[PDB]
Amino acid sequence: MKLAILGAGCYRTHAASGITNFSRACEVAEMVGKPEIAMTHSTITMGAELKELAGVDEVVVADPVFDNQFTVIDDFAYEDVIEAHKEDPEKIMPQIREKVNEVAKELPKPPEGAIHFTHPEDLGFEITTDDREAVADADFIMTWFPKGDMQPDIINKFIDDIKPGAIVTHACTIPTTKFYKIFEQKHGDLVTKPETLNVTSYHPGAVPEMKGQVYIAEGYASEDAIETLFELGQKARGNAYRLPAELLGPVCDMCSALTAITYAGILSYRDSVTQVLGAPASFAQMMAKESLEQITALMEKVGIDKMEENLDPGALLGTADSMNFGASAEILPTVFEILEKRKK
Amino acid sequence: MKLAILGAGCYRTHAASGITNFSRACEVAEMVGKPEIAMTHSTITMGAELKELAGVDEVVVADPVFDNQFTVIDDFAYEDVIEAHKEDPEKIMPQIREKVNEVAKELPKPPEGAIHFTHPEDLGFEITTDDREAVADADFIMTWFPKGDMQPDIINKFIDDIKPGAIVTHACTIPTTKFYKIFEQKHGDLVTKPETLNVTSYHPGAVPEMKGQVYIAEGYASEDAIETLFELGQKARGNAYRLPAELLGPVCDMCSALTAITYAGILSYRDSVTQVLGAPASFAQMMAKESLEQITALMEKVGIDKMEENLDPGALLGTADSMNFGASAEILPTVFEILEKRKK
Amino acid sequence: MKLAILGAGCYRTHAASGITNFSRACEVAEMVGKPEIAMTHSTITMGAELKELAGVDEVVVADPVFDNQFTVIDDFAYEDVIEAHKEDPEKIMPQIREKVNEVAKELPKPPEGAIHFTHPEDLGFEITTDDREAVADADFIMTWFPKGDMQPDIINKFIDDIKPGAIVTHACTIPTTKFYKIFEQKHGDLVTKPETLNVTSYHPGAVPEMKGQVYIAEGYASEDAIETLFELGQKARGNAYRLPAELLGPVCDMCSALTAITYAGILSYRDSVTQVLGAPASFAQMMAKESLEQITALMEKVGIDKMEENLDPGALLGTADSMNFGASAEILPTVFEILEKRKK
Amino acid sequence: MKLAILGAGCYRTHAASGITNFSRACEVAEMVGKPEIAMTHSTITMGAELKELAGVDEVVVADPVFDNQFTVIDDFAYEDVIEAHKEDPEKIMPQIREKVNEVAKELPKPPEGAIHFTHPEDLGFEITTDDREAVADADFIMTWFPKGDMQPDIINKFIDDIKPGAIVTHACTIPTTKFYKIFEQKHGDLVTKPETLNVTSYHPGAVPEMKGQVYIAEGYASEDAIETLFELGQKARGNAYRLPAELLGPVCDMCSALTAITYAGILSYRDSVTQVLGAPASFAQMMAKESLEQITALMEKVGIDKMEENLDPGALLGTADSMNFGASAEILPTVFEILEKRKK
Amino acid sequence: MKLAILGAGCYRTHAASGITNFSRACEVAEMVGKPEIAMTHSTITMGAELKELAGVDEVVVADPVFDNQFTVIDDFAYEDVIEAHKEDPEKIMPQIREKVNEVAKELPKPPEGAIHFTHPEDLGFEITTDDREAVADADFIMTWFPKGDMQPDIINKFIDDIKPGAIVTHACTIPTTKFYKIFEQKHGDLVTKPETLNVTSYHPGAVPEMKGQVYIAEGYASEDAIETLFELGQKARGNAYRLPAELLGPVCDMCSALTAITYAGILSYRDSVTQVLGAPASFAQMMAKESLEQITALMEKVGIDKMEENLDPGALLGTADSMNFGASAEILPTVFEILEKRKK
């Protein structure tokens, strides 16, 4: 198949964050014996994986930046980075960040400037400034566009050139629904033919060069399209996750921590009710729904910063302790230390 | 297993309707060589099926009416009814209705009176006036209670006597949700133990003696409980249907016709979009959702009797004709004759 | 009155669709003895109708394309097309499509290029590149803008130049609500004066040159404005439909087929309940609401492509058959063939 | 036609209120030359009006109280009350209240006791203890039942005896929707035939003997049924109002004052926007919707007693003053005195 | 602290409205002995107040217009305007409007043209064309941007240059929620750091030079940030109002009149119920909620222009009169004159 990456991306924001590395990129480079992969970042790493590990036959990277100031840093040798990542990334990352940060002081933001460490061409990739040429014959188009009102306009330029049934994906810069609306149009006429694209996501849930993982939004694409991408991503990224499009944010955004906590609570609570009390899962759900809707409603009603003034954390210590059995007992003791500490 | 039927029911309303027969009851009676089944009705027929065809070991029929005026009509011989149903039920049904209607003129309504044609005892069934005794050791309790505020009070008397994990079912007299709330309680304390019952439905979707079919509401019971009842009902009734509890009304109530029409429309429309246009099913759903929500909203906004004044049926002839392809072409020509006839 | 058409449109997409003709445009041309109308398309046809058949005194066509590559094809004589449309449009349409398609291969998309067959000037129309000049003194402004984020920006340039109380319309490229928000502003101050425009639609529900019909969205404009346009459109297009703004999509979009089916179902079902059962229309509505809300909810809950796994089409055959009377009997037999074919 | 009143009612609560009179009852009695009408109350007055002024041929009053302690007070002569009401009801009402209050100290509440001043029989009415006998052949059934869970059970006893198409009404003791559900049933089967009744209201919006007015809930009954009752009530009560069932509470309950204020505001505000600003009524509605939804949301969010802490009444004086023109200027000056007085 | 005003604004629309003056600007100028303030307008007045009366140390005005045609009118002497505003603004405002209107005939709209009367530099302000330079080190950024899709793009250029914890405000051109979304981003990754800004409003609720008042939207910023701005605005504008972000529109938009009316109604109605009837405020709220939701629902259901056809204004006169006591009696008599006049 033909993969058309639209957006090479820039490492400035990764280096600026001060908390990333090339652990995955390195791991891949060592697996396939191509040192140049070690310092690839963003879609280049993901493209590297799909070509080298998933068997994607043709890769094309499209980005206006290639004609603009596409900056490649040759200061760090690939092998040094690989060997440093083998024991402790921090033996070379602070040095890497300062150079990127220095380059980024004057360098314009994308698409006028991009900080990379590997030339896509070296990975056998075809580079292009124009997106239409890239999407031509592409079975899988991977978008890595900027956050903003430009994604619909960026897309409209190559939408007619998209092959029927192609898998089109988005990443952390845009919600699935919003992205899907650009391609599929509700209002029209007999003349305007609906698109037939399989819209999904190829969301890293982190900087692709640091972690090997992908999140694939379900609900807009054919199941075959989801299976095809799921199988590609499982091979390319190592850890692929299929999930409803509505949960992509909850799981990949800064709220991930609360979704995690809450989900553990729900699953634990449910199991204590079905396995210890023996009640049907429908009773556990009715109870769960009560908790969730009300505590969320309270946070909306008075504000997340005024909950304690309305519901003292201590009020739950006197009642929840009786439900401390089954799976819930794996999480309640911790939860109680937190409410003990916050009680009025 | 032990089956505890709570409510024998009465044939007055069936005879009064003027449109029912004993076709199923007859079909069963002939299958098992027990003529007495031919004129059984309501739960007696269903119990007859479960004992004779599903292998239910113990059947108990509980109804206060047994101590009251439980009337059995011996005017029609079982074989005559069977032979009449073999070619045309109407050769004996008009005669049957008049006798039931005559008996029903003075006879009190249940639980003070009940019109039957077969003595449950003859089918090997245990009869009881008290429900607690009946539900004792019952693996499957089949409720056939009257429509009204009495179902919670009728139930509260034997709820503590219900065996853990028992399958409790309801029929056309009450919605699943409403019925489920009687057993499972949201508000309580450590002292009040939640019930562990598998609440579902054993809804005939007609008078049990006329049609062999059952509707089993999903979402409140364990999947095992649904499978067990599904397998019993498939054997006992012949045609069993598993469906979400929310659709039990839509499918079994007087609205069945509109659900049917609409569902065919949705499935046809979807197929024309996925198979002819090639668009993803998500696009078909987005379009469908548009139609359904808006036409329903219009009916609510101006009233089902004032739609034509606001949306002329003719307005759709000029636009829908272009979508007349694929599966939709099996239903649009008919649909067009109806809008042609109703256009302003 | 003065009509200001903003957007001449382009025939490429019509020709590309492979399913359109000039039947209406021809019919008009023959009615008014002006052959040039036969090959007009989009707003030119509609403007032709309003000037020639509705008595609109002054027509102005505004489009940046006139200064750009506005391409007119002189390959087909008007009379040939008229005579061909008199018996079978397909005797000349395939030939017409290939030429348009060939012209459209290199020609840029609007507003840089437009494929027409008649010079607006020949119809007595005033052509302009600038919209402000066009809307000046316009009693009726007919927008035919592109689908996208540009409509608000296109509009803002001439909004102050719009005459108070003018009728402003939109077509298939934008929803009424969205379009209305561009003109009328909710947030402001004493200084910002609310607009007084009569926002509606002049939606062809097809390519204007093929069908004579218009859809006029109600709810945003004065009733006088709706009556004025309704009377113009009835004369100009032949078949004008007044309808709530919320139904414009449902009726004119690809969902038209399902709205049609559903509406017939509702009207048929209602009539069987009020005319055969005698129940009040309020009972029919309560039942209808049950059907619609639940079947729509099911499609949303599990997905339009997974309904059968949850509600077997066959489940409705056993129940709906009893409601097969009255108006509903005109649609149920067909509906049953569809569910018979799809039953699990 | 035949009118079946179900519930005679009791005057204790009227006398206890300390604020009622017999002004209407008196006015009727004088109009028809029947002094006995002067001291009738509740449904007896309304029945008196329908028989004497609307031409209702047969009146039947059904109430279990007739067999129980139905108390009639002969202490006040009809003519004295009429003459007293001719100039000032308070010349005899305080005396009337004390006697009723004294009688009501020991007398049981209905249906065991009822305080009246006129024997229904004297008005030519047929009195009955049993409701089934009363509703037989009744074209118009007027329910005057107690507030509570008993209305469905009271109704179920005579529902089968109700004539098809009969007009069934309720008063201040029950909401229309709730009342309608008792008669019309959503869940059933082919056997259970839907009711065909025309459910509405004959709501006095006060004690019938004090004011001549009726409120008739629309949306559940046939338009003919509403017209028939509207025409009866206009003749019988003098001031009849047809209105959507949803507004019966808003208009007749203690909230009437706020509905009144608000409605005047909406109508005034709308007129200033359409008549002075010239904006379309759709703009006035968009603005109105903003106001109403938000101020209501604020009251729900913080509580009606904490609004000032969140939105100072004074905040609106600085902004609303600019909108003080047109119809709104009839209500804003007053409204400003109230906000001036309440500003923080 | 450092104040960075982004947008100087233009007086054309103020002069065009025909209903504004410089009363506040004058009042300030006289208070601080700086005549030049008298004819300042928009943010210049507000900046003048914050520097002169609130003690803001550094003011910066950023606007692309300064490099473009920034027009200053020297035709009216400051003192003449001050003396004219001392007794009657209309002795000089008509003359001022005509000159501004004449200048505005050819002058381009902002940011290409701006009509002012005082050079910001004279007030000690730093003027700049570039926003990034202005926001640098700004503790309080005051946005005065145009209404439209440009605010997010205008903002994105200086967002990274914004100091952590800065107070960012918007005015009548944009809703708080919409404005807040530009800065705070829900979707992202570990790399994209959430903003830490205190988003609020500095909404004049009129032209700043006419009235001394500000509205500060609560719910998005820290309470400290709201207190800081509240205290600045109270000193600078004289009348500052803290209110939930949801009410900013309701209170400052053209709907202000209806919010005012309604709010007075709610507060009056509540007080009659709690103070006269003695019922709890929860009962008043339940009643209020009934009124508001239903009357709003009716306006949505049939349209603000068709309410009378469905609910006759007269219907409330017969019922509300009984609730005419307590605080409500301050508003009901007026309200009754309006319903008397509009009754069918």
mmCIF file of C-alpha atoms in Angstrom, chain D residues 86-218:
data_model
loop_
_atom_site.group_PDB
_atom_site.id
_atom_site.type_symbol
_atom_site.label_atom_id
_atom_site.label_comp_id
_atom_site.label_asym_id
_atom_site.label_seq_id
_atom_site.Cartn_x
_atom_site.Cartn_y
_atom_site.Cartn_z
ATOM 1 C CA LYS D 86 -75.054 43.067 44.975
ATOM 2 C CA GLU D 87 -73.036 45.729 46.910
ATOM 3 C CA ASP D 88 -70.450 44.052 49.149
ATOM 4 C CA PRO D 89 -70.001 40.286 49.672
ATOM 5 C CA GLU D 90 -68.192 40.972 52.984
ATOM 6 C CA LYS D 91 -71.478 42.068 54.581
ATOM 7 C CA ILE D 92 -72.408 38.327 54.818
ATOM 8 C CA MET D 93 -69.208 36.237 53.961
ATOM 9 C CA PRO D 94 -67.524 36.526 57.444
ATOM 10 C CA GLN D 95 -70.776 35.186 58.952
ATOM 11 C CA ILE D 96 -70.895 32.408 56.350
ATOM 12 C CA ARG D 97 -67.259 31.383 57.001
ATOM 13 C CA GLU D 98 -67.683 31.014 60.773
ATOM 14 C CA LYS D 99 -70.669 28.694 60.386
ATOM 15 C CA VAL D 100 -68.845 26.532 57.809
ATOM 16 C CA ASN D 101 -65.727 26.521 59.964
ATOM 17 C CA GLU D 102 -67.789 25.470 63.023
ATOM 18 C CA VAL D 103 -69.482 22.679 61.005
ATOM 19 C CA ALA D 104 -66.046 21.627 59.667
ATOM 20 C CA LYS D 105 -64.461 21.289 63.150
ATOM 21 C CA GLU D 106 -66.001 17.827 63.774
ATOM 22 C CA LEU D 107 -67.283 16.933 60.242
ATOM 23 C CA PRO D 108 -65.084 14.373 58.424
ATOM 24 C CA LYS D 109 -63.301 15.288 55.190
ATOM 25 C CA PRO D 110 -64.760 14.121 51.829
ATOM 26 C CA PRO D 111 -66.002 11.628 50.733
ATOM 27 C CA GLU D 112 -67.285 11.094 54.327
ATOM 28 C CA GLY D 113 -68.447 14.725 54.727
ATOM 29 C CA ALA D 114 -69.317 17.727 52.528
ATOM 30 C CA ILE D 115 -70.485 21.215 53.329
ATOM 31 C CA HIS D 116 -73.059 22.592 50.872
ATOM 32 C CA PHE D 117 -75.843 25.181 51.038
ATOM 33 C CA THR D 118 -78.103 23.903 48.220
ATOM 34 C CA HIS D 119 -79.477 20.387 47.634
ATOM 35 C CA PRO D 120 -78.427 19.382 44.062
ATOM 36 C CA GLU D 121 -81.840 17.668 43.587
ATOM 37 C CA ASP D 122 -83.521 21.149 43.796
ATOM 38 C CA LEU D 123 -81.633 22.234 40.633
ATOM 39 C CA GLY D 124 -83.284 19.321 38.755
ATOM 40 C CA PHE D 125 -80.080 17.283 39.040
ATOM 41 C CA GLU D 126 -80.019 13.526 39.486
ATOM 42 C CA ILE D 127 -77.885 12.528 42.432
ATOM 43 C CA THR D 128 -75.992 9.203 42.622
ATOM 44 C CA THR D 129 -73.497 7.477 44.877
ATOM 45 C CA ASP D 130 -72.204 5.213 42.032
ATOM 46 C CA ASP D 131 -70.064 6.731 39.202
ATOM 47 C CA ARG D 132 -70.697 3.962 36.625
ATOM 48 C CA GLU D 133 -74.433 4.767 36.551
ATOM 49 C CA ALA D 134 -73.618 8.448 36.176
ATOM 50 C CA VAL D 135 -71.160 8.182 33.257
ATOM 51 C CA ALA D 136 -73.557 5.902 31.341
ATOM 52 C CA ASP D 137 -74.597 7.832 28.158
ATOM 53 C CA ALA D 138 -72.649 10.884 29.331
ATOM 54 C CA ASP D 139 -71.395 13.048 26.462
ATOM 55 C CA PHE D 140 -69.482 15.222 28.928
ATOM 56 C CA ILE D 141 -68.024 13.811 32.177
ATOM 57 C CA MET D 142 -66.764 16.529 34.595
ATOM 58 C CA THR D 143 -64.341 15.135 37.193
ATOM 59 C CA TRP D 144 -63.813 17.007 40.476
ATOM 60 C CA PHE D 145 -61.697 14.389 42.279
ATOM 61 C CA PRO D 146 -59.413 14.736 45.315
ATOM 62 C CA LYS D 147 -55.692 15.473 44.955
ATOM 63 C CA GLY D 148 -53.798 12.167 45.322
ATOM 64 C CA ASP D 149 -52.998 8.624 44.165
ATOM 65 C CA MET D 150 -56.765 7.794 44.223
ATOM 66 C CA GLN D 151 -57.751 9.426 40.905
ATOM 67 C CA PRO D 152 -56.559 6.457 38.768
ATOM 68 C CA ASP D 153 -58.379 3.960 41.032
ATOM 69 C CA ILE D 154 -61.498 6.189 41.220
ATOM 70 C CA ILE D 155 -61.468 6.380 37.410
ATOM 71 C CA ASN D 156 -60.752 2.651 36.644
ATOM 72 C CA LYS D 157 -64.165 1.743 38.168
ATOM 73 C CA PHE D 158 -66.190 3.555 35.433
ATOM 74 C CA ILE D 159 -63.697 3.778 32.511
ATOM 75 C CA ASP D 160 -65.282 0.800 30.634
ATOM 76 C CA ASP D 161 -68.707 2.349 31.136
ATOM 77 C CA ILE D 162 -67.553 5.554 29.352
ATOM 78 C CA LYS D 163 -69.237 6.296 26.006
ATOM 79 C CA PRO D 164 -66.877 6.482 22.978
ATOM 80 C CA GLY D 165 -65.734 10.025 22.117
ATOM 81 C CA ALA D 166 -66.928 11.456 25.439
ATOM 82 C CA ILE D 167 -65.414 14.681 26.715
ATOM 83 C CA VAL D 168 -63.673 13.917 29.992
ATOM 84 C CA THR D 169 -62.380 16.823 32.043
ATOM 85 C CA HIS D 170 -60.258 17.444 35.155
ATOM 86 C CA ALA D 171 -59.815 20.504 37.408
ATOM 87 C CA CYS D 172 -57.070 22.002 39.704
ATOM 88 C CA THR D 173 -56.448 18.710 41.603
ATOM 89 C CA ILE D 174 -54.491 16.990 38.785
ATOM 90 C CA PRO D 175 -52.169 17.872 35.839
ATOM 91 C CA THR D 176 -53.577 17.213 32.357
ATOM 92 C CA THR D 177 -50.801 14.787 31.377
ATOM 93 C CA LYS D 178 -51.180 12.798 34.566
ATOM 94 C CA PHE D 179 -55.002 12.702 34.128
ATOM 95 C CA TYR D 180 -54.759 11.780 30.399
ATOM 96 C CA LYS D 181 -52.496 8.744 31.203
ATOM 97 C CA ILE D 182 -55.233 7.206 33.364
ATOM 98 C CA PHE D 183 -57.544 6.917 30.329
ATOM 99 C CA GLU D 184 -55.153 6.457 27.361
ATOM 100 C CA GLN D 185 -52.713 3.561 27.682
ATOM 101 C CA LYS D 186 -49.426 3.302 25.851
ATOM 102 C CA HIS D 187 -48.644 -0.300 26.709
ATOM 103 C CA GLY D 188 -50.965 -3.084 25.643
ATOM 104 C CA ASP D 189 -51.779 -5.658 23.004
ATOM 105 C CA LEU D 190 -54.290 -6.272 20.204
ATOM 106 C CA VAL D 191 -56.766 -7.405 22.898
ATOM 107 C CA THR D 192 -56.645 -4.154 24.928
ATOM 108 C CA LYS D 193 -58.496 -1.566 22.809
ATOM 109 C CA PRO D 194 -57.222 2.052 23.133
ATOM 110 C CA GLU D 195 -59.722 4.484 24.580
ATOM 111 C CA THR D 196 -61.281 7.061 22.222
ATOM 112 C CA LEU D 197 -61.937 9.773 24.801
ATOM 113 C CA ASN D 198 -61.523 13.532 24.357
ATOM 114 C CA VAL D 199 -59.533 14.422 27.476
ATOM 115 C CA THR D 200 -59.403 18.081 28.399
ATOM 116 C CA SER D 201 -59.972 20.380 31.381
ATOM 117 C CA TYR D 202 -62.850 22.449 32.810
ATOM 118 C CA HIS D 203 -60.534 24.298 35.217
ATOM 119 C CA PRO D 204 -62.178 27.252 37.028
ATOM 120 C CA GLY D 205 -58.883 28.910 37.937
ATOM 121 C CA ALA D 206 -60.705 29.931 41.150
ATOM 122 C CA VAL D 207 -63.650 28.720 43.195
ATOM 123 C CA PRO D 208 -66.439 28.374 40.540
ATOM 124 C CA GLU D 209 -68.994 30.313 42.683
ATOM 125 C CA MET D 210 -66.722 33.379 42.914
ATOM 126 C CA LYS D 211 -65.538 33.829 39.266
ATOM 127 C CA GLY D 212 -67.119 33.016 35.911
ATOM 128 C CA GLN D 213 -64.199 31.570 33.946
ATOM 129 C CA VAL D 214 -62.907 28.245 32.652
ATOM 130 C CA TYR D 215 -59.598 27.029 31.283
ATOM 131 C CA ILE D 216 -59.715 24.311 28.591
ATOM 132 C CA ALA D 217 -56.441 22.317 28.077
ATOM 133 C CA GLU D 218 -55.656 21.702 24.367
#
